[PDB]
Amino acid sequence: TPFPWNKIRLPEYVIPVHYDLLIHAQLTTLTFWGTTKVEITASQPTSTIILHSHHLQISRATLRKGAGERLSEEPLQVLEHPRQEQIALLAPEPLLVGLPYTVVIHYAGQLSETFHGFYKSTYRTKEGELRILASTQFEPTAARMAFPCFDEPAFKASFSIKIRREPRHLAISNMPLVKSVTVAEGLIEDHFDVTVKMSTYLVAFIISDFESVSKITKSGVKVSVYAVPDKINQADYALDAAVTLLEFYEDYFSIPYPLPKQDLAAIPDFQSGAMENWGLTTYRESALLFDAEKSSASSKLGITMTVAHELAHQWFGNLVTMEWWNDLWLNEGFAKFMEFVSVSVTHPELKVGDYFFGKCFDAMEVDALQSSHPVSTPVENPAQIREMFDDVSYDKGACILNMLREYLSADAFKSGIVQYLQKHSYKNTKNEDLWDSMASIGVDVKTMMNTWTLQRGFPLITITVRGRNVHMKQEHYMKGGYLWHVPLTFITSKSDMVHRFLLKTKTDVLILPEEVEWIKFNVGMNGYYIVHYEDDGWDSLTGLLKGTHTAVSSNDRASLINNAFQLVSIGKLSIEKALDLSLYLKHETEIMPVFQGLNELIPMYKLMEKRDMNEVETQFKAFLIRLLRDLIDKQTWTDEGSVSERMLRSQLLLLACVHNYQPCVQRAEGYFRKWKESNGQLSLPVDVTLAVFAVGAQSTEGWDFLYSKYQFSLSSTEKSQIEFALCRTQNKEKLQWLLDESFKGDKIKTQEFPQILTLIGRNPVGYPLAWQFLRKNWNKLVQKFELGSSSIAHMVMGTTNQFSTRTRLEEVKGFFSSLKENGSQLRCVQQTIETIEENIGWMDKNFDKIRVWLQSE
Numbered sequence: 001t002p003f004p005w006n007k008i009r010l011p012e013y014v015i016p017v018h019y020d021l022l023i024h025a026q027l028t029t030l031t032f033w034g035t036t037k038v039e040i041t042a043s044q045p046t047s048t049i050i051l052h053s054h055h056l057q058i059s060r061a062t063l064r065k066g067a068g069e070r071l072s073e074e075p076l077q078v079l080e081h082p083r084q085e086q087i088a089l090l091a092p093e094p095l096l097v098g099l100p101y102t103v104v105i106h107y108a109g110q111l112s113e114t115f116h117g118f119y120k121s122t123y124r125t126k127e128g129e130l131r132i133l134a135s136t137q138f139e140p141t142a143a144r145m146a147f148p149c150f151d152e153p154a155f156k157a158s159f160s161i162k163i164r165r166e167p168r169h170l171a172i173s174n175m176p177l178v179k180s181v182t183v184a185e186g187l188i189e190d191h192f193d194v195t196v197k198m199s200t201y202l203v204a205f206i207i208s209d210f211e212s213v214s215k216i217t218k219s220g221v222k223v224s225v226y227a228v229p230d231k232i233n234q235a236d237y238a239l240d241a242a243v244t245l246l247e248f249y250e251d252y253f254s255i256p257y258p259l260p261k262q263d264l265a266a267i268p269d270f271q272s273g274a275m276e277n278w279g280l281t282t283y284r285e286s287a288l289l290f291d292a293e294k295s296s297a298s299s300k301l302g303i304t305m306t307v308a309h310e311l312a313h314q315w316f317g318n319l320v321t322m323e324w325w326n327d328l329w330l331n332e333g334f335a336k337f338m339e340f341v342s343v344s345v346t347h348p349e350l351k352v353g354d355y356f357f358g359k360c361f362d363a364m365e366v367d368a369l370q371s372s373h374p375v376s377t378p379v380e381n382p383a384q385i386r387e388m389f390d391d392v393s394y395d396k397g398a399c400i401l402n403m404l405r406e407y408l409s410a411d412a413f414k415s416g417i418v419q420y421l422q423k424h425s426y427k428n429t430k431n432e433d434l435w436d437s438m439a440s441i442g443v444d445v446k447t448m449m450n451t452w453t454l455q456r457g458f459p460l461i462t463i464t465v466r467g468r469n470v471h472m473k474q475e476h477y478m479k480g481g482y483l484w485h486v487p488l489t490f491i492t493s494k495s496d497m498v499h500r501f502l503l504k505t506k507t508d509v510l511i512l513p514e515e516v517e518w519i520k521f522n523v524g525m526n527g528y529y530i531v532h533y534e535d536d537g538w539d540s541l542t543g544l545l546k547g548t549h550t551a552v553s554s555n556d557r558a559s560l561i562n563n564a565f566q567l568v569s570i571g572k573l574s575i576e577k578a579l580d581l582s583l584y585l586k587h588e589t590e591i592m593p594v595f596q597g598l599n600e601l602i603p604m605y606k607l608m609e610k611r612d613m614n615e616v617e618t619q620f621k622a623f624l625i626r627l628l629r630d631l632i633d634k635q636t637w638t639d640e641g642s643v644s645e646r647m648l649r650s651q652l653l654l655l656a657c658v659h660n661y662q663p664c665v666q667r668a669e670g671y672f673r674k675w676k677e678s679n680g681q682l683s684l685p686v687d688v689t690l691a692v693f694a695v696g697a698q699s700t701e702g703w704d705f706l707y708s709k710y711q712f713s714l715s716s717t718e719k720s721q722i723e724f725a726l727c728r729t730q731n732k733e734k735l736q737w738l739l740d741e742s743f744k745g746d747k748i749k750t751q752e753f754p755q756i757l758t759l760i761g762r763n764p765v766g767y768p769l770a771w772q773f774l775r776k777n778w779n780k781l782v783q784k785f786e787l788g789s790s791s792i793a794h795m796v797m798g799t800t801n802q803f804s805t806r807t808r809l810e811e812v813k814g815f816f817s818s819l820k821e822n823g824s825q826l827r828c829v830q831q832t833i834e835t836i837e838e839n840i841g842w843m844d845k846n847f848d849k850i851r852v853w854l855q856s857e
């Protein structure tokens with residue numbers, strides 16, 4: 001019998017209203033069984049129900065109608081279409097239109113050995129015992145691997161979840177536990193309250209031995225953090241941050257959080273950073289747990305931002321959800337942007353607003369290529385949907401919202417998002433709904449925002465000044481006809497007020513009130529565009545940075561560094577003039593422009609490390625250390641100062657040590673020796689630990705000692721610092737061991753494999769091993785992480801995007817083309833191919849220019 005449905009999307013005429021999910025997981029055999037009951041109505045007569053199911057063995061399906069004495073069951077025949085991830089349920093007679101029915105399905109499955117679906121997670125107690133837990137990760141399309149369902153985000157429904165478990169385990173889910181009942185064969189059945197109407201991807205449940213801590217918000221919501229017993233003492237920071245951030249969002253959106261509780265659970269094995277399941281947010285342990293003695297300043301910032309992101313989704317994603325994955329940015333761009341809006345208020349000590357523009361420069365790297373996609377773009381299959389969780393949806397999405405908020409004003413933007421969330425509560429939206437809500441305040445936003453969401457890329461704005469006359473032009477910036485409504489901003493030598501000008505056309509002109517010495521567009525880098533200055537413009541701005549760099553803000557200095565190097569790539573500014581501009585950094589003190597200088601200069605030597613360019617590579621590295629020497633020498637070997645001062649210290653000391661700057665190497669060697677001689681008991685300053693460990697791991701004894709401490713560590717920061725240091729070894733047997741062991745997952749968890757593979761891909765001697773490992777183990781890596789996942793994208797780019805020869809380019813094209821349906825069409829593959837093509841052209845054009853410039857410098 002042929003399958004009676006030939007589309008990837010489900011039929012629109014059978015709608016669920018409520019699910020009752022009964023799940024029994026047997027953690028000793030890894031088998032699980034379920035009974036799903038789904039209440040549906042049909043709007044057109046049909047005897048066939050199509051729904052999603054993947055890797056579930058269906059034992060029986062029945063169709064119920066009526067209740068009590070009028071209950072009429074009818075058996076259903078089951079057909080499956082595994083490629084479409086669907087099942088078809090066939091009734092002996094047609095369903096009556098508009099009447100309620102309940103589909104009852106009994107099935108079994110095996111706990112996934114991946115990081116998605118209903119999957120197995122493990123950890124070892126400090127006492128040595130292996131413990132097994134079971135957790136969920138469904139977004140985007142994995143709910144169908146745990147229970148059969150209408151697994152598309154616009155088929156919202158309420159869910160009543162029941163879990164049968166052993167008495168030794170605890171179960172938690174989206175809603176509060178309302179009753180626990182003893183059932184047959186020594187099991188306990190937990191009943192959770194019914195959820196509000198929501199998408200299937202937000203269902204969650206965890207069977208574990210977790211401990212918890214709790215705190216109640218001003219609104220009466222019970223917030224808890226869950227973690228393994230050995231790590232619950234690390235939960236207080238995230239618990240306090242979650243309460244503050246949930247209270248912030250309730251007041252900000254004027255819409256209370258609707259559930260009685262909110263849980264934040266640290267899972268021992270987790271693929272992404274975190275997930276926003278309504279009432280049960282989940283995290284990597286490194287994204288939630290803070291050790292006041294060993295955690296880094298960057299990890300404190302990261303936990304705060306991750307918690308802010310997941311809590312923003314309770315409104316942007318959960319309460320209001322995109323209608324389909326083509327508009328995933330409505331969830332992700334908003335949640336990413338709301339991290340900065342909220343944390344700027346709740347944790348002013350972190351000064352997170354200063355870092356926001358960095359996300360925009362990240363998006364511009366990918367968005368300058370032809371392989372970029374518009375923010376809103378069509379997707380159909382699960383691999384294509386997973387590809388939407390990328391820097392375009394998250395970072396470009398947040399950046400265009402920041403640009404829109406600055407254009408409309410914060411208050412008008414806030415009014416628009418409140419109307420949007422209120423109007424579409426418990427429903428789904430598309431792009432046009434957001435523009436309609438923003439326009440309902442009091443400005444047409446649709447034409448402008450369609451230019452930023454329906455076209456890939458961004459514009460280059462060119463400025464030409466002749467006395468008081470300021471000529472403006474826009475063109476698509478591309479490496480290798482578009483038109484936007486660009487909300488320009490500028491300051492000048494005579495006015496530090498932020499001036500605004502909306503450029504809606506190819507060119508325009510404005511007349512300054514009086515002549516100026518300089519003009520600087522894109523103030524604070526709040527706009528998603530880059531700027532070129534004709535004539536003496538770049539000389540004026542170079543002179544400004546060299547003589548009075550505090551004339552513009554730290555973020556404005558970072559924007560000039562980024563844009564100067566971006567203009568070299570398209571032939572608008574020579575590499576010599578951009579390097580001449582970078583010389584001002586000898587007097588720079590602030591983290592954002594120093595880090596932006598590193599973001600532009602470091603990749604140049606990473607390309608050289610993989611070429612026969614030893615002499616120029618050494619000279620370029622010596623130039624970089626000489627450039628930042630005074631700032632490096634000023635660093636104290638302590639944990640003193642602001643979060644920015646701590647992050648700047650850590651990276652400068654690590655950079656100096658990696659490049660053999662003897663004063664820093666000698667000090668790191670001394671700390672490592674005393675730390676090792678004290679059997680690793682001694683508390684080192686966290687901010688110098690990366691440099692200390694990276695130096696210490698350069699000997700066989702130091703590498704072995706560092707690895708010996710890894711198994712006992714309960715600190716996510718310390719484990720990450722050890723992994724980084726071990727990956728800097730130049731012993732290829734140890735590099736291959738790190739790849740083999742993290743791939744296996746026993747001594748180093750597989751959740752660390754993508755980072756370890758990229759770090760070894762960036763090791764000056766070990767980089768060929770990482771690309772070789774990815775090719776050899778491709779099938780197993782795809783099975784573990786999934787085609788289209790951000791993890792696979794990061795592995796592809798991490799192992800190949802610093803190649804710069806035609807031979808390496810053909811290796812990449814030839815390998816990925818050979819995969820056919822198992823990877824040849826990945827967007828990350830086209831992105832890395834275009835990046836290598838740019839690297840080839842850039843090195844061919846600029847290598848000798850840099851060699852000559854270094855000799856003159």
Ligand SMILES: O=C(Cn1c(=O)sc2ccc(-c3ccccc3)cc21)NC1(C(=O)O)CCCCC1
Pocket residue numbers: 595598599600602603606651654655658762763
């Ligand atoms: O090069 C890299 C990694 N990396 C790339 O591969 S491309 C890239 C662009 C920017 C940065 C970066 C921005 C800010 C602060 C600090 C770094 C880093 C980076 N790491 C080191 C190295 O392998 O030589 C080793 C550690 C110290 C830094 C240098």
Ligand SMILES: [Zn+2]
Pocket residue numbers: 309313331332335336
């Ligand atoms: Zn998100």
